[PDB]
Ligand binder design. Structure first.
Ligand code: ATP
Ligand code: ATP
Ligand code: ADP
Ligand code: ADP
Lengths: 28, 24, 530, 316, 107, 21
């Protein structure tokens, strides 16, 4: 029996929260 | 964890396209 | 109540298991029906574990599901047994823990009012082996034992395990505190067979589609050492035979289905299927005998009658005795004398429900360990009947004897010697027959003490006997017969029957003129004395 | 009573007395319930509920099985046809066993004693060891047999020896029975050949004393003493007992009378033929001969028996 | 009486009749009387023999003539892995379609 | 998925620029 695991990341820069604030402001 | 990535990404595309069309 | 409002034993459809169900009810279900007030006054704790062991072909799984539904169970969770396994480290333990989440949640939220949870594990022996690195099989048992009777306390669970081999399970799982009760499910008797047949024929009897000629008591009598799966297969095969009888006369020609609607399974279908479709695992098999007795048993002299009578006496003694459940006999003689055939015939004429023969032929190229495994498996299977007969042929070949040296496998010898003096469980009978050709060397190995008696098979040693054998065989003519008789009577002969047949075949290839001469010349050449 | 229960149960773990009590209570309450196909409770009978000694005794006999205590089936699987006093030697052997168990039980300076039982084959010495062990009343008794080691390798056998002896080491008093030493060693006159490892393990395992003043008793059985003496193994054993065969025709007549077989004039005619000679046979063969001889018609049974006894009564 | 001629397999003709007689009688007879009989169908058959003797062709013809779905071919030696047992994963993907088919369409 | 996200980013860029104008 054997084996180990690993992990990684990626370039995402979502910031959907800020974009949502901005676009809502645009609507009003 | 890719499940919530796909969920948020679908939500993002839907909202962005819709919101852009409304602004336009 | 915790049980379903409606349930009756007869509806469950299980046939034969009567005392076992009663005992399981009394042990593992007494406290769950007795009113809560007196129970809390008891302060006792319900049982939270049960194990079932039976031989293959009892479908205890039926009993598992049937018990699960008998109660007002919610949704019995099931695991095949090899699942919950993964390559990644620390995954099986988590999966095991996931099983009890609902139980612990209910135990924390409610108390003394939560419903019952049932888990059905299949083949516990697969993973829960003895804990010695045993790889992942050691870290899983600890978690399981960690869960059951853990630092914390659960009182709303019940675990059922099924396994065919009960002596390869971890002992630590077997305590007065978890998985305590164990029950054995064995082969049924006549009454159980009758009940099973009734269960499986009720529907056919309902639609008047079962012929009135068929009898069920006769079927129950005939089928011996049979199991529920085998019996259901028998019924299905009979239906299929009755069916095929109509696939060539009515629907084959697309003629009125009235004759197709007159379909009725009859006794003929059963008595045709019972002989050419089903092979019981623990019952006789009428193909080995015809494979061994290639040319019948012709009587050429008195010794045959004596041998047959002695074998019959041995068989009767085994059947009718009480203080001697084990008996042995050894057949010996010169090579090519017809030992195997006589042993097969005497075995066939016993009428026992279980019979088996083992030959070097079915193990060529094996290693000693594999031979030992085969022998122990055969004997273990035999142990499970009320009457049985086993034949071990060419003992010298199993040990791999060779005069140079000598050399042989001591291990197989020790295994055989030990086995020859082991009694079966209480109340069961056995009978062992051995065949050899070198009684001396067998004696030097001290093994003749184990055997109970011996029989001697001689050869032909007189011209009168040879002439009688030739006459009984049906070859050659009167003048040839007379010439041979007037030639051979003077001297003595020494030959085994099998070589005689070989020689006759040898001689029967020349021209009609020289046949007798060649036969006589060869016979003289292949002659010797004690 | 609680005193009887406490005395009668020995070497029980804390998890087993509770299970016993639960089983007794379950049986007691199940008594009242009367339902086979349709569940039903006789509430009338539930008004008065009590537990009697019968519950405890039935549970003890049937339900609970101690892991470190003594178990009764083992003693059932070896003394199959009982013990019959056919001669003086049996009493001698039993008394000697009594003396040995007494010494080991009530002595210091000697917490380990070993005895050897030897004799010709079929003499019935295996059962006698079980009988001796049954009269010690020791809390822990165990028998180790080759019957359960078919096909094992040397390492497996020695590990079995380890596990049994280690388990025995965990009680105040203990008896262990080793049967058919020769079969354990895998002996065969040719070569000769055998497993040295098992021999070394046994030799070293007859001198290790139990820790801190715990007693122990070992009873070994065999049938070929000469080989053992050639192995220097008789030094390990502390003494030796002998089990002989039957020799005299009067002994044979006594055995026949005791068994419950040919009687009346039959016996008389038999007596007329054996008394004037010597006999030599073990009892196990006598039983086998008696059984085999009973399948003829009631007119030659004596003849067949006598012919056999002549053929097998060798070396008088 | 079926038919086995000019459609590829030509050598084996009696074998179809034998195997059909032994196996395929339940699925040919009108289902109504069958459910009245309350019987189950066979759950598998074995073929064996020397290599390259047209066994796969026989299986494909049988599959075509029963109107069953596309057979899911697979080999023996392929399904084996060194990750402390990942064969069960290999084994389980094969029965999904039947599982979902049973879940949705029932009986 | 990712290709759809590339299409989305292209469209969004275009829309933002023409919004600016
Ligand atoms: N009355 C008979 N007695 C013995 N054998 C007979 C008799 N009638 C026919 N035979 C034939 O004798 C042959 C018996 O051969 P068998 O294998 O039993 O002999 P064997 O001496 O044990 O040989 P082997 O040592 O090769 O096993 C079979 O062909 C059997 O058909
Ligand atoms: N007085 C007796 N002494 C000994 N055995 C007796 C006596 N009476 C009856 N028996 C029976 O004799 C049989 C003894 O056989 P046992 O197996 O002990 O023989 P053995 O010569 O010691 O051989 P083995 O070493 O193979 O065990 C048992 O069935 C026992 O019940
Ligand atoms: N006593 C019985 N009565 C009716 N059917 C049985 C019986 N025993 C087995 N079967 C049938 O055998 C089938 C499979 O049994 P299975 O659970 O594999 O046996 P086991 O539990 O011994 O492995 C079941 O579908 C069941 O109908
Ligand atoms: N009876 C037959 N008639 C025509 N072609 C055959 C027959 N048997 C085998 N073949 C041909 O031999 C080749 C190998 O057959 P295959 O189906 O692989 O047999 P197997 O399954 O035994 O390997 C195929 O290309 C097939 O066309």
């Amino acid at each position: 029996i054997s084996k180990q695991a690993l992990s990684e990341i990626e370039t995402r820069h979502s910031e959907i929260i800020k974009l949502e604030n901005s676009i809502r402001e645009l609507h009003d | 964890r890719a499940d919530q990535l796909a969920d948020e990404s679908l939500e993002s595309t839907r909202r962005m396209l819709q919101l852009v069309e409304e602004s336009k | 109540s915790i049980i379903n409002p409606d349930w009756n034993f007869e509806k469950m459809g299980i046939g034969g298991l009567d005392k076992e169900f009663s005992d399981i009810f009394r042990r593992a279900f007494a406290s769950r029906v007795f009113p809560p007030e007196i129970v809390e006054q008891m302060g006792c704790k319900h049982v939270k574990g049960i194990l079932l062991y039976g031989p293959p072909g009892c479908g205890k799984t039926l009993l598992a599901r049937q018990i699960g539904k008998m109660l007002n169970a919610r949704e019995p969770k099931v695991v095949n047994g090899p699942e919950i396994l993964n390559k990644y480290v620390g995954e099986s333990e988590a999966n095991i823990r996931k099983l009890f989440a609902d139980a612990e949640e209910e135990q924390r939220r409610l108390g003394a009012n939560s419903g019952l949870h049932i888990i059905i594990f299949d083949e516990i022996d697969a993973i829960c082996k003895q804990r010695g690195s045993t790889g992942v099989h050691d870290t899983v048992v600890n978690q399981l034992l960690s869960k059951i009777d853990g630092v914390e306390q659960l009182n709303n669970i019940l675990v059922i395990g099924m396994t065919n081999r009960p002596d390869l399970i971890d002992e630590a799982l077997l305590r007065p505190g978890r998985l305590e009760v164990k029950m054995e499910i064995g082969l049924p008797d006549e009454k159980g067979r009758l009940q099973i047949l009734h269960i499986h024929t009720a529907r056919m009897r309902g639609h008047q589609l079962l012929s009135a000629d068929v009898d069920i008591k006769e079927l129950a009598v005939e089928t011996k050492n049979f199991s529920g799966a085998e019996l259901e297969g028998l019924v299905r095969a009979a239906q299929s035979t009755a069916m095929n009888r109509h696939i060539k006369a009515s629907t084959k020609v697309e003629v009125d289905m009235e004759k197709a609607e007159s379909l009725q399974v009859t006794r003929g279908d059963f008595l045709a299927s019972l002989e050419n479709d089903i092979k019981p695992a623990f019952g006789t098999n009428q193909e080995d005998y015809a494979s061994y007795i290639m040319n019948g048993i012709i009587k050429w002299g008195d010794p045959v009658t004596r041998v047959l009578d002695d074998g019959e006496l041995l068989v009767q003694q085994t059947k009718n005795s009480d203080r001697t459940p084990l008996v042995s006999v050894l057949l010996e003689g010169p090579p090519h004398s017809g030992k195997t055939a006589l042993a097969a015939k005497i075995a066939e004429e016993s009428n026992f429900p279980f019979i088996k023969i083992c030959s070097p032929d079915k193990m060529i190229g094996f290693s000693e360990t594999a031979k030992c495994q085969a022998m122990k498996k055969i004997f273990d299977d035999a142990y499970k009947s009320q009457l049985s007969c086993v034949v071990v042929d060419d003992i010298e070949r199993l040990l791999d004897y060779v005069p140079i040296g000598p050399r042989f496998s001591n291990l197989v010898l020790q295994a055989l010697l030990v086995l020859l003096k082991k009694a079966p469980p209480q109340g069961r009978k056995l009978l062992i027959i051995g065949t050899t050709s070198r009684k001396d060397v067998l004696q030097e190995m001290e093994m003749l003490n184990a055997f109970s008696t011996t029989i001697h098979v001689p050869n032909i040693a007189t011209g009168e006997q040879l002439l009688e054998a030739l006459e009984l065989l049906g070859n050659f003519k009167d003048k040839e017969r007379t010439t041979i008789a007037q030639q051979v009577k003077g001297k003595k002969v020494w030959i085994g029957i099998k070589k005689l047949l070989m020689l006759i075949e040898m001689s029967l290839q020349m021209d009609p003129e020289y046949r007798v001469r060649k036969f006589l010349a060869l016979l003289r050449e292949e002659g010797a004395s004690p």
